[PDB]
Amino acid sequence: YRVRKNVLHLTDTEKRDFVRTVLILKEKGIYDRYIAWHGAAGKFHTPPGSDRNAAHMSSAFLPWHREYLLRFERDLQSINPEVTLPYWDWTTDAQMQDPSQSQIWSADFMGGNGNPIKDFIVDTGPFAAGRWTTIDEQGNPSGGLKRNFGATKEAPTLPTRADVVKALAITQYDTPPWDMTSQNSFRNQLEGFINGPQLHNRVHHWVGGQMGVVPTAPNDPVFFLHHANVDRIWAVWQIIHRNQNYQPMKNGPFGQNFRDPMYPWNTTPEDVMNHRKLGYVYDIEDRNDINGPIFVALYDYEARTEDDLSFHKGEKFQILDSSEGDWWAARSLTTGEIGYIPSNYVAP
Ligand SMILES: [Zn+2]
Ligand SMILES: [Zn+2]
C-alpha cells in the first residue's frame, strides 16, 4: 500500500520532503525518542549476563529493526502523509570506483563525508553541524554528526550484491545459540558477524562516525535508510524461503522467541513477520522494477542446484539480476517462487 523506494529513484522533491520531515521530527522532540529506544534496547540483555540484547546479536535483530522503522515511518507520515521511508541500496554503491560519490551523500540529501580539518564533523547537507545536534551514550549533547567513509581497516568497502546473494541462500532464519556465533544463520549473516564485519555491520563501520558505534548510530539519519535496505533484504528472503519461518519459536531466551515482546515495546516478532500486513511494501514488489520480462520458458527445465527453479515451457519470468550473465535471478509468474534460471532457456 505504502511504497518504500530506492534512494536512486527518489525525485528531488521527494528527497527534499524526506529531509524536511526528519528535521521536523527532530524539532518536535520525537526523533530523540528513537535514539533513546535504540540505546535502551542495546543494553537490555537476553538473558542478563549474555552479550545478546533485545535489538542486536540475536534473533530479534531483524523483527526489532522492522518495528523501529515502522514506528519511525508512522511519525514521518503524521507530519506529511505522502512521505515513506526510502532505502539505501549499498550494493549498487559498492559497484562505483568511489562509493562516496553516491548521490545519497549530496548536500540535498544526507550530506557529505566528515571533514578531517574539522575533526571529521559533517559540514555539508541538512544534518551538518550547526543544523543538527547530536547526543552521546549518556544523553549529553555532543554537537556534531561525524562520518569517515571507508577509513577503518576491517571495513574499507561496502558489501556487494554477491554478499547479499550468499545470505539470501541460507535456508534457516537463525540457529542455536541464537547470537553472534550462529552458523548457517540468515539472520547472523545479514547482521554480519560471520567473518565480520560483513553486510549490515560492515555498512555501519564503513560510514564511520556515530554510525560506527551502535548505541549512537541513530544520530545519523542514514541509519534509517541503511536499515530500510536490511529490512528489504529480509523481506526478499521471506518471499524466497516462503516455507521457512522465524526461529526460535520457543525455548530461546525470553524476548527472542516468535511470541515474546521485544523490549522496549510489546511488539512480538510474530506481530511484524508479514511486512505487507503492516501496510508497506518495497518498490521491487509492484511492476517493472529495473527491467522487463526476458520471460517465456522456451523449454522445460529441471533444477540442478538448490537455488535453481524448475519450470515448464510456457512459464513467464520477472528477471531480477543480470550480474552473472548465464544464470540470472528470476521470479516465476505462475508459482511466484524465486531462484535461478539459465539465460539460454528464455527469450523476451
Ligand atoms: Zn540497531
Ligand atoms: Zn544497525
Automatic annotation (TrEMBL):
<feature type="binding site">
    <location>
        <position position="108"/>
    </location>
    <ligand>
        <name>Zn(2+) 10</name>
    </ligand>
</feature>
<feature type="binding site">
    <location>
        <position position="51"/>
    </location>
    <ligand>
        <name>Zn(2+) 7</name>
    </ligand>
</feature>
<feature type="binding site">
    <location>
        <position position="65"/>
    </location>
    <ligand>
        <name>Cu(2+) 2</name>
    </ligand>
</feature>
<dbReference type="InterPro" id="IPR002227">
    <property type="entry name" value="Tyrosinase_Cu-bd"/>
</dbReference>
<feature type="binding site">
    <location>
        <position position="38"/>
    </location>
    <ligand>
        <name>Zn(2+) 5</name>
    </ligand>
</feature>
<feature type="binding site">
    <location>
        <position position="200"/>
    </location>
    <ligand>
        <name>Cu(2+) 3</name>
    </ligand>
</feature>
<feature type="binding site">
    <location>
        <position position="12"/>
    </location>
    <ligand>
        <name>Zn(2+) 3</name>
    </ligand>
</feature>
<feature type="domain" description="Tyrosinase copper-binding">
    <location>
        <begin position="220"/>
        <end position="231"/>
    </location>
</feature>
<feature type="binding site">
    <location>
        <position position="119"/>
    </location>
    <ligand>
        <name>Zn(2+) 11</name>
    </ligand>
</feature>
<feature type="binding site">
    <location>
        <position position="227"/>
    </location>
    <ligand>
        <name>Zn(2+) 13</name>
    </ligand>
</feature>
<dbReference type="Pfam" id="PF00264">
    <property type="entry name" value="Tyrosinase"/>
</dbReference>
<feature type="binding site">
    <location>
        <position position="275"/>
    </location>
    <ligand>
        <name>Zn(2+) 15</name>
    </ligand>
</feature>
<comment type="similarity">
    <text>Belongs to the tyrosinase family.</text>
</comment>
<dbReference type="InterPro" id="IPR050316">
    <property type="entry name" value="Tyrosinase/Hemocyanin"/>
</dbReference>
<feature type="binding site">
    <location>
        <position position="91"/>
    </location>
    <ligand>
        <name>Zn(2+) 9</name>
    </ligand>
</feature>
<keyword id="KW-0862">Zinc</keyword>
<feature type="domain" description="Tyrosinase copper-binding">
    <location>
        <begin position="56"/>
        <end position="73"/>
    </location>
</feature>
<protein>
    <submittedName>
        <fullName>Tyrosinase</fullName>
    </submittedName>
</protein>
<feature type="binding site">
    <location>
        <position position="56"/>
    </location>
    <ligand>
        <name>Zn(2+) 5</name>
    </ligand>
</feature>
<feature type="binding site">
    <location>
        <position position="276"/>
    </location>
    <ligand>
        <name>Zn(2+) 16</name>
    </ligand>
</feature>
<feature type="binding site">
    <location>
        <position position="227"/>
    </location>
    <ligand>
        <name>Cu(2+) 3</name>
    </ligand>
</feature>
<dbReference type="GO" id="GO:0016491">
    <property type="term" value="F:oxidoreductase activity"/>
</dbReference>
<feature type="binding site">
    <location>
        <position position="241"/>
    </location>
    <ligand>
        <name>Zn(2+) 14</name>
    </ligand>
</feature>
<feature type="binding site">
    <location>
        <position position="56"/>
    </location>
    <ligand>
        <name>Cu(2+) 1</name>
    </ligand>
</feature>
<keyword id="KW-0479">Metal-binding</keyword>
<feature type="binding site">
    <location>
        <position position="9"/>
    </location>
    <ligand>
        <name>Zn(2+) 1</name>
    </ligand>
</feature>
<keyword id="KW-0186">Copper</keyword>
<feature type="binding site">
    <location>
        <position position="204"/>
    </location>
    <ligand>
        <name>Zn(2+) 13</name>
    </ligand>
</feature>
<feature type="binding site">
    <location>
        <position position="38"/>
    </location>
    <ligand>
        <name>Cu(2+) 2</name>
    </ligand>
</feature>
<feature type="binding site">
    <location>
        <position position="283"/>
    </location>
    <ligand>
        <name>Zn(2+) 2</name>
    </ligand>
</feature>
<feature type="binding site">
    <location>
        <position position="162"/>
    </location>
    <ligand>
        <name>Zn(2+) 12</name>
    </ligand>
</feature>
<feature type="binding site">
    <location>
        <position position="38"/>
    </location>
    <ligand>
        <name>Zn(2+) 4</name>
    </ligand>
</feature>
<feature type="binding site">
    <location>
        <position position="56"/>
    </location>
    <ligand>
        <name>Zn(2+) 4</name>
    </ligand>
</feature>
<dbReference type="InterPro" id="IPR008922">
    <property type="entry name" value="Di-copper_centre_dom_sf"/>
</dbReference>
<feature type="binding site">
    <location>
        <position position="204"/>
    </location>
    <ligand>
        <name>Cu(2+) 3</name>
    </ligand>
</feature>
<feature type="binding site">
    <location>
        <position position="56"/>
    </location>
    <ligand>
        <name>Cu(2+) 2</name>
    </ligand>
</feature>
<feature type="binding site">
    <location>
        <position position="65"/>
    </location>
    <ligand>
        <name>Zn(2+) 5</name>
    </ligand>
</feature>
<feature type="binding site">
    <location>
        <position position="9"/>
    </location>
    <ligand>
        <name>Zn(2+) 2</name>
    </ligand>
</feature>
<feature type="binding site">
    <location>
        <position position="200"/>
    </location>
    <ligand>
        <name>Zn(2+) 13</name>
    </ligand>
</feature>
<feature type="binding site">
    <location>
        <position position="275"/>
    </location>
    <ligand>
        <name>Zn(2+) 16</name>
    </ligand>
</feature>
<dbReference type="GO" id="GO:0046872">
    <property type="term" value="F:metal ion binding"/>
</dbReference>
<feature type="binding site">
    <location>
        <position position="67"/>
    </location>
    <ligand>
        <name>Zn(2+) 8</name>
    </ligand>
</feature>
